[PDB]
């Protein structure tokens, strides 16, 4: 039976891990002790034990202790083994240099032994959900070294990659593009699918729609957990058309180098606004295609779509799914590549999305998750290359990376590796 | 099924829409929450739980005139996204409302119109309300017609407009905006309903006997006019008349789409119940020069068309008796190329009454839409006013600093002169 | 005698067959437990065709449920007629094909076939004289369109003379639920032309047009999808499972409907589909069926028969009727439509009559027809399939399975040959 293992990395992965593992627990009914008061839909994420205790299939590995010690002192401390909360004495402190070659290597072994035993617990393994960021040194360098050792360990197993993209305007760091540029080699050759997303777009949507004018880091992670739960909803519960990971992993990636689709979830609305708004399927598919609802700050008009993945959920009927897709295709403003007039993968499930108390989204019977692979994300990496270049000319902050122990040459080669990726997307935009 | 979308613009727009949606909800039985405890598809759309949302987008540039509605009794009736406000207003400046402030919210309102088009299946009409005095309600309205024409080239867009009163005026810089709005109302509209407040003041004083009327009294009459127009769409009748039908039988030439409305009976409760009321008398009252809500005399001009809309307990026999009686009158004149200049609609349901209002509960009523040449004199007077303002180049620097080239004022004056000359050509008879 | 084995591959095949077995159980009066509560001896008359005997007056379906994913069989086992199936008829792997045709056909499905050939040989040797094999699947799946194509390849070598049909689901361009669907279909039809006596090309789109327009259903679920197929394959064998006024079986149609070995593709039909309102205004007369028989809105495929010529037409009628009007409306339709029908074959159409009506009805008909319109199905795929192939799009999932680049050109070549010969017979002189 299907199973998935969580390799949340960084403070972002830990914080999202607190949010997401809260979301599946209420989805399935697991108590904060870890016992169901009342078939095996939890088998994808939870594992039974001798005492009837259900154990999440996750590792919360960080290299600074205080972020994980909060989980150790939280309400759901009793829901893990005191092993996979793997901590470190001294962190990378926003350095890809420290997290790849010096401090990461002291707990390479223990992290790789842990993922071995969870893989040993499971019988049929589908894929790995790995959460990190492109900014933080632990989230970028350490997440890179674990991955390239995961490729040798499991050649076929799906390695989907949730990562946090630094925002075009706002930033919590100054040396983050140095970490971001070097991490692209990990996400290009050592990944199957990428879900690059910035915090800035999530700031916009909650304020405009959800009336969350002040978004704390918990509100963003709640939206992250719902997107992840929508992906695995076909695995956990039955549907008229269940779609496993390999089913949609195949149907997004035309070329091995192009595995960077864009996530979109709908509807995201408060109870004060949904009361006067009738909700059906035809308009919420239009909600996935607004430029203001894109999780990545980009314009769909600039690019064109090569592949789109629909993940409907809840009280949905396939007829109006076909009716909705009729309306979308009959539009000039929608642009599709010349070599894919049929670019759609529909996912249908029965159980509606669940709502956590103290959240933001209202209880809505139907929802849709959009996974669109377009070439409009091409400009997204163009701005970093400009941002990287105006630091690369002045040789700023290089003594930190050189002092930790890399030759300066790989900084240049990675830049060309991004640059080659840009032209590959440019070939996609060319229509014969 | 039939659908009409209201796009209220400006302070006049929001107040008139308040009136209109009020009497609409009491017409059909919608609660202030928006449920029927016990035909509505044209102006309300259904939800799952039995809620019904109005198909209106209130939009302005000054937030107070809509946040009064937000704190009003119908706050939960309206979807809050239908209420669109700007931070700063044009302050009665056409250039401000068309080229500096409007373009910020143009995308939002057009996306909203996209959403309503998605909600609707068979769309019949866009009803837009604004004024010719306010800067927002002139320039913003002009650009929204200009864009909405290319978004829906075929769809009908009726244009209810407040025309600046011949004598009284709430502003001094209003003739410039009124001059510049004419190009849009000429080349981006199918039918327009100009009306001034002065004549409605006169009607309310002479007939309905309020010595000190307010804006609500006038807006109730305008809402009654809109209700009489759309009653054929809302409910059945012996002759249902659609917007396409009465827009066909009103417009002889593309440049001439400015009918004048009329409503009857308009009288108090005691005199209403105490006088015998009949189709002949209400039809004769429709043609009285004192009951016109535009300050012009059709006896000075010639009718080219008459769109007639009875309502209530009316009979085709006395309908035709009245039409013969009206035709047998030398005072009423008709153009030579229209021996038959009438189109009559019949509706069963009598008009309803709104509390705090002015009309009595009357078993029959009538609306008239006369297309005559008598309206051009008002444009002549506003041309005289605009010329005597423009000779001294007063208040031009405001629009120039807003960023507009000066010659379009003279261009719009030329357009109005050409429209007047076309009206004169229609007035010329080939005898 | 004349026995039948129902293969079940892919999620599409599994739910369709689950409803399919439910239908015939009501037709034969078999309860969910497995016993018989009917009354007519005709119910237990030819019951061995579909089912097998068990102790305690119990009868068990002859089906092989195959799926690479173990989740679908939980839904099937939890269905209404869920316990009537055999637990080791459920032969399932642990990982799916991921809608990747090469994975099911080569990599993982080749691990599950050997267990499948065990059971399909088991049901084959129990019956003394098996009629043929029945398989339902979708061309847009990974197991049904993938390993299922391998399944028909081997079984043909083992059992050459027995018939086999496939109620395969053909993908549609206006509503496509899979982007690599033309890739899976192009590699699946090449398997179908070589080893298949007859195919019933079902398009899911036209059925949505069927229920929305003719039936007036607001929310047609996938159960209503499976009905209209489940009523269809029941109608093909209703002459086999019951005595008829003019008898037929699967072979009688098969020899009559395939003029040349390349052409075995058919669009099905069912006459009495009427909404709730339409029964108020209806006369249960057999001329009324013939319009519902011959209207293009009735078709279950995505090809208007107006644009091609009818090659061979077949009509089986389920119910008690005078068959003077079987061959009268027959002749009226052909004479009036002499232009559309092919000319080198006069009297193009077939008849068959079963005396026993459908359960809950008096009179039903099932249409099977071979026309030139079916060539519009495949060239639409080729316009779209050639699009990805020219840029080698979505190729690494296929090339990564250890397989070459030649078979994409060969499948297209075999495809492009078939339509050309099909078009050649469209433009033929008598």
């Amino acid at each position: 039976m299907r199973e998935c293992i969580s390799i949340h990395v960084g403070q972002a992965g830990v914080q999202i891990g607190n949010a997401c593992w809260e979301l599946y627990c209420l989805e399935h009914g697991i108590q904060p002790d870890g016992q169901m008061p009342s078939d095996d839909s939890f088998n994808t994420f939870f594992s039974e034990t001798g005492a009837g205790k259900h154990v999440p299939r996750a590792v919360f590995v960080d290299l600074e202790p205080t972020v994980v010690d909060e989980v150790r002192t939280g309400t759901y401390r009793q829901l893990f083994h005191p092993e996979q909360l793997i901590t470190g004495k001294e962190d990378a402190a926003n350095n890809y240099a420290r997290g790849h070659y010096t401090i990461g290597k002291e707990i390479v072994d223990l992290v790789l032994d842990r993922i071995r035993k969870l893989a040993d617990l499971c019988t049929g393994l589908q894929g790995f959900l790995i959460f990190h960021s492109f900014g933080g040194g632990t989230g970028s360098g350490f997440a890179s070294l674990l991955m390239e050792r995961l490729s040798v360990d499991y050649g076929k197993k799906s390695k989907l990659e949730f990562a946090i993209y630094p925002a075009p305007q706002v930033s919590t760091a100054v040396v983050e593009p140095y970490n971001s540029i070097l991490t692209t080699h990990t996400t290009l050759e050592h990944s199957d699918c990428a879900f690059m997303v910035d915090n800035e777009a999530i700031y916009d949507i909650c304020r405009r729609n959800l009336d969350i004018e002040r978004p704390t880091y918990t509100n963003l992670n709640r939206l992250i957990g719902q997107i992840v739960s929508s992906i695995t909803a076909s695995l956990r519960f039955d549907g008229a058309l269940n779609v496993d990971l390999t089913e949609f992993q195949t149907n997004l990636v035309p070329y091995p180098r192009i595995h960077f689709p864009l996530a979109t979830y709908a509807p995201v609305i408060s109870a004060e606004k949904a009361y006067h708004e009738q909700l059906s399927v035809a308009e919420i598919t239009n909600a996935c295609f607004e430029p203001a609802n894109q999780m990545v700050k980009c314009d769909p008009r600039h690019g064109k779509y090569m592949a789109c993945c629909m993940l409907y959920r809840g009280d949905v009927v396939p007829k109006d799914v076909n009716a909705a897709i009729a309306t979308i295709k009959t539009k000039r403003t929608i642009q599709f590549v010349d070599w894919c007039p049929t670019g759609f993968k529909v996912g249908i499930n029965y159980q509606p999305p669940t709502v956590v108390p103290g959240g933001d989204l209202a209880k809505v019977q139907r929802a849709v998750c959009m996974l669109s692979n377009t070439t409009a994300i091409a400009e997204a990496w163009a701005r970093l290359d400009h941002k990287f270049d105006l630091m690369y000319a002045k040789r700023a902050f290089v003594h930190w990376y050189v002092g930790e122990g890399m030759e300066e040459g790989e900084f240049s080669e990675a830049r060309e590796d991004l640059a080659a990726l840009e032209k590959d997307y440019e070939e996609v935009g060319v229509d014969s | 099924m039939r659908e009409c979308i209201s796009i209220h613009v400006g302070q006049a727009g929001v107040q008139i829409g308040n009136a209109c949606w009020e009497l609409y909800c009491l017409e059909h039985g919608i609660q202030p929450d928006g449920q029927m405890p016990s035909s509505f598809n044209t102006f309300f759309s259904e939800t799952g739980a039995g809620k019904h949302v109005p198909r209106a987008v209130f939009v302005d540039l000054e937030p107070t005139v809509v946040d009064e509605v937000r704190t009003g009794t119908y706050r939960q009736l309206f979807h809050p996204e239908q209420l669109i406000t700007g931070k700063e207003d044009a302050a009665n400046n056409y250039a401000r409302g068309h080229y500096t402030i409007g373009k910020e919210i143009v995308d939002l309102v057009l996306d909203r119109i996209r959403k309503l088009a998605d909600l609707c299946t068979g769309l019949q009409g866009f009803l837009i309300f604004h004024s010719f005095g306010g800067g927002t309600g002139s320039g913003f309205a002009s650009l929204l017609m200009e864009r909405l024409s290319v978004d829906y080239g075929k769809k009908s867009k009726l244009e209810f407009a407040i025309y600046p009163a011949p004598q009284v005026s709430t502003a001094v810089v209003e003739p410039y905006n009124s001059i510049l709005t004419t190009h849009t109302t000429l080349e981006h509209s199918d039918c327009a309903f100009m009306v001034d407040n002065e004549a409605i003041y006169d009607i309310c004083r002479r007939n309905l006997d309020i010595e000190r009327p307010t804006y609500t009294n006038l807006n109730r009459l305008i809402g009654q006019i809109v209700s009489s127009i759309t009653a054929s769409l809302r409910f059945d009748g012996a002759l249902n008349v659609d917007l396409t039908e009465f827009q066909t039988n009103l417009v002889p030439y593309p440049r001439i789409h400015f009918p004048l409305a009329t409503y009857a009976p308009v009288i108090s409760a005691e005199k209403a119940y105490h006088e015998q009321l009949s189709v002949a008398e209400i039809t004769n009252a429709c043609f009285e020069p004192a009951n016109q809500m535009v300050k012009c005399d059709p006896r000075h001009g010639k009718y080219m068309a008459c769109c007639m809309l009875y309502r209530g307990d009316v009979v085709p026999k006395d309908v035709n008796a009245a039409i013969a009686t009206i035709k047998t009158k030398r005072t009423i004149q008709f153009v030579d190329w229209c021996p038959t200049g009438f189109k009559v609609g019949i509706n069963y349901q009598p008009p309803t009454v709104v509390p705090g209002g002015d009309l009595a509960k009357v078993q029959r009523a009538v609306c008239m839409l006369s297309n005559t040449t008598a309206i051009a004199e008002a444009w002549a007077r506003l041309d005289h006013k605009f010329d005597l303002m423009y000779a001294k180049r007063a208040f031009v620097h405001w629009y120039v600093g807003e960023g507009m080239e000066e010659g379009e004022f003279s261009e719009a004056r030329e357009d109005l002169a050409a429209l007047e000359k076309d009206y004169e050509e229609v007035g010329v008879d080939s005898v | 005698m004349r026995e039948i084995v129902h293969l079940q591959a892919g999620q599409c095949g599994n739910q369709i067959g689950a409803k399919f077995w439910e239908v015939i159980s009501d037709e034969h009066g078999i309860d969910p437990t497995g016993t018989y509560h009917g009354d007519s001896d005709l119910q237990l008359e030819r019951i061995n065709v579909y089912y097998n005997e068990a102790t305690g007056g119990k009868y068990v379906p002859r089906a092989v449920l195959v799926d690479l994913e173990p989740g679908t069989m939980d839904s099937v086992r939890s269905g209404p007629f869920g316990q009537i199936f055999r637990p080791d008829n459920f032969v399932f792997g642990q990982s799916g094909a991921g809608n990747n045709w090469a994975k099911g056909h080569y990599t993982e499905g080749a691990e599950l076939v050997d267990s499948v050939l065990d059971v399909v040989r088991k049901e084959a040797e129990s019956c003394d004289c098996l009629q043929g094999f029945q398989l339902t699947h979708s061309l847009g799946g990974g197991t049904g369109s993938g390993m299922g194509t391998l399944l028909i390849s081997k079984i043909r070598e083992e059992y050459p003379d027995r018939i086999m049909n496939t109620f395969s689901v053909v993908p549609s361009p206006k509503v496509s639920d899979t982007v690599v669907e033309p890739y899976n279909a192009t590699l699946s039809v090449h398997q179908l032309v070589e080893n298949t006596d007859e195919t019933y090309c079902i398009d899911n789109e036209a059925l949505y047009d069927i229920c929305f327009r003719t039936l007036k259903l607001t929310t047609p679920t996938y159960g209503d999808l499976n009905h209209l197929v489940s009523a269809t394959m029941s109608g093909v064998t209703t002459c086999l499972r019951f005595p008829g006024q003019l008898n037929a079986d699967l072979r009688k149609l098969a020899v009559n409907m395939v003029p040349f070995p390349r052409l075995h593709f058919f669009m099905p039909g069912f006459a009495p589909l009427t909404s709730r309102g339409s029964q108020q205004y209806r006369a249960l007369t057999v001329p009324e069926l013939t319009q519902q028989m011959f209207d293009a809105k009735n078709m279950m495929a995505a090809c208007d028969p107006r644009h091609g010529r009818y090659l061979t037409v077949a009509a089986v009628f389920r119910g008690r009727m005078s068959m003077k009007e079987v061959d009268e409306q027959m002749l009226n339709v052909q004479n009036k439509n002499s232009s559309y029908f092919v000319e080198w074959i006069p009297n193009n159409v077939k008849t068959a009559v079963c005396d026993i009506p459908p359960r809950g009805l008096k009179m039903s008909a099932t249409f099977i027809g071979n026309s030139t319109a079916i060539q519009e199905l495949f060239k639409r795929i080729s316009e779209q399939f050639t699009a990805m192939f020219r840029r080698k799009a979505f190729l690494h999932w296929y090339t990564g399975e250890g397989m070459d680049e030649m078979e994409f050109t060969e499948a297209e070549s075999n495809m492009n040959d078939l339509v050309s010969e099909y078009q050649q017979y469209q433009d033929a002189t008598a």
């Binding site: 607004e290 403003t333 | 088009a117 | -």
Partner: peptide
């Protein structure tokens, strides 16, 4: 006769959901 009515459609049109909102 042969009853060929694949043509029975109503009318429905609307522009595209591409227009920017300015965050």
């Amino acid at each position: 006769s042969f009853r060929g009515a694949p043509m029975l459609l109503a009318e429905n049109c609307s522009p595209g959901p591409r227009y920017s909102v300015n965050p």
